[PDB]
Design a protein around this nucleic acid. Structure first.
Lengths: 296, 296
DNA sequence: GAAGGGGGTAACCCCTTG
DNA sequence: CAAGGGGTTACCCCCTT
């Protein structure tokens, strides 16, 4: 869209299913993969400097989930990283694409958060006056920290890629616009699991409903879940599972009774969809097929 | 059951399903119940002084699981307790039975264990030499502590009732033999809750086996557990569920295929039992009935 | 409200496998 | 080791009478 040189995320990170590691857990536990990684094909976050060919330097750091992108308490740890959480690669005059195949997220302790925060905030405001730092600003620097620690989500981070075109000097000194990735959720964090149907005991029934199904899923909250049956033919037929939270077994299974199909006296089987749906959210699981059958 | 007065545990504590509380959790989280408590009928650990009627003092403290009963790092907390973990009641000249209806177990931190240990050990060896404790004696007492902390199970405790018959003095100075209860497992610990079958999708099958059942459980260790089918000591015939640990869905469910019954073409249907059984241990869930059907 | 239960959350500690 | 994963502790809350 912009005429000038710019960075583009070729492959965003995994928005779900990456674990943030604490300082104690040990240094390599896996690298942040790409949004299209599977067991066979692994992919990693990738970016490219479009609208220029030449030597250049791309760096990533963790920013808040909040759109005004501020530095996160969390740091990137990796084979290619600063001890501030800043990861740096060099793109060759031919290859303008940077893959970041070994990126970890160091999870800060809540009792660590302030000091880690003032430390990244100092580092940030050192270019304005590198010789020395005044109390007059150290007081107000600590003021950001406190206000940020109150609202900062330790479960969600965003990669921020900052590209720098090496100048005539030999100095990698020219900035490009910084490009912020989609959010990255901690896999080991409260709720915010993607609703998954592992398997079900029945995939067929009668048009009459009332057929009892055992559904195995990933963690669900007994009071926030439902089982939506539907046909997305724009008729927009929908009905629901019949159960009580007691029927939701230790947040990993649902025993429900199928609803009746809208139209009985059907002559042939009809395939519909069912899906888990959080009422409190909008969030849905992958839909599975269910086939209604005719009568007597 | 010899000549003299002795104590007897009328109602032992619940060997499973009691939670030990840390110092931080609070007081008043519930009392150690008797082995026969239900939500309607509550019962608490009870003991009686046999072969004597008169004023007497019974005290309870936590001892190791190890047969040589040594004092546990854990302390009893409650309305009737010392700050050392010693709980004391008085039995009247009429009623020689003592109920302990509010007993909590204060869980020591592993970094607390040493100091709590030397402190209970001093208290133990303070009537042996109350004047002072000699430096020479100090280091031998500290040794016990270290070699006891290495093998002491913080998940299992035993109540030790020490009864004392009050003399003519007014001094509760006569000892009875101390009676040690059966072990008490921390509910919140590795394998110390009860294997439970919540519900199953099928309670009947064919003699041929291979019928797929969804079983909902309380918890499982995925590669620990099995599904034992068996007869009522007809011969003790037994067979097993067919499933991989992949089939055990997240510690709360098992999808298995029923085994074939030993004798096919049974003229009419046969009811057998199935049960969860830890492969490692002996431990079994409550058995559920399953009915085999003949062929056609 | 406190008692009397129970479940979730942070931080860490591990164990499988290559 | 790397790359996942699950389980453990100490603590923090939260429902119900």
């Amino acid at each position: 869209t912009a005429d000038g040189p710019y960075l583009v995320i070729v492959e965003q990170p995994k928005q779900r299913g990456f674990r943030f590691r604490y300082g104690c857990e040990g240094p390599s536990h896996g690298g942040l993969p790409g949004a299209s990684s599977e067991k066979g094909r692994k992919t990693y976050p990738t970016v490219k400097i479009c609208n220029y060919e030449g030597p250049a330097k791309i760096e990533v750091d963790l920013v808040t989930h909040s759109d005004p992108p501020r530095a996160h308490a969390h740091s990137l740890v990796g084979k290619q990283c600063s001890e501030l959480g800043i990861c740096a690669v060099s793109v060759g005059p031919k290859d303008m694409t940077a893959q970041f195949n070994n990126l970890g997220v160091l999870h800060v302790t809540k009792k660590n958060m302030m000091g880690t925060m003032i430390q990244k905030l100092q580092r940030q405001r050192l270019r304005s006056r590198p010789q020395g730092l005044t109390e007059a600003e150290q007081r107000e620097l600590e003021q950001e920290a406190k206000e940020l620690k109150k609202v900062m989500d330790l479960s969600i981070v965003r990669l921020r890629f900052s590209a720098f075109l090496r100048a005539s000097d030999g100095s990698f000194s020219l900035p490009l616009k910084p490009v912020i990735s989609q959010p990255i959720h901690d896999s080991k964090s409260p709720g915010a699991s993607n609703l998954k149907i592992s398997r079900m005991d029945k995939t067929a029934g009668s048009v009459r409903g009332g057929d009892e199904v055992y559904l195995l899923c990933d963690k669900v909250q007994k009071d926030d879940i439902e089982v939506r049956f539907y046909e997305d033919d724009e008729n927009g037929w929908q009905a629901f599972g019949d159960f009580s939270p007691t029927d939701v077994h230790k947040q990993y299974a649902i025993v429900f009774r199928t609803p009746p199909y809208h139209k009985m006296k059907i002559e042939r089987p009809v395939t519909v969809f069912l899906q888990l749906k959080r009422k409190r959210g909008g969030d849905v699981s992958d839909s599975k097929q269910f086939t209604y059958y005719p009568l007597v």
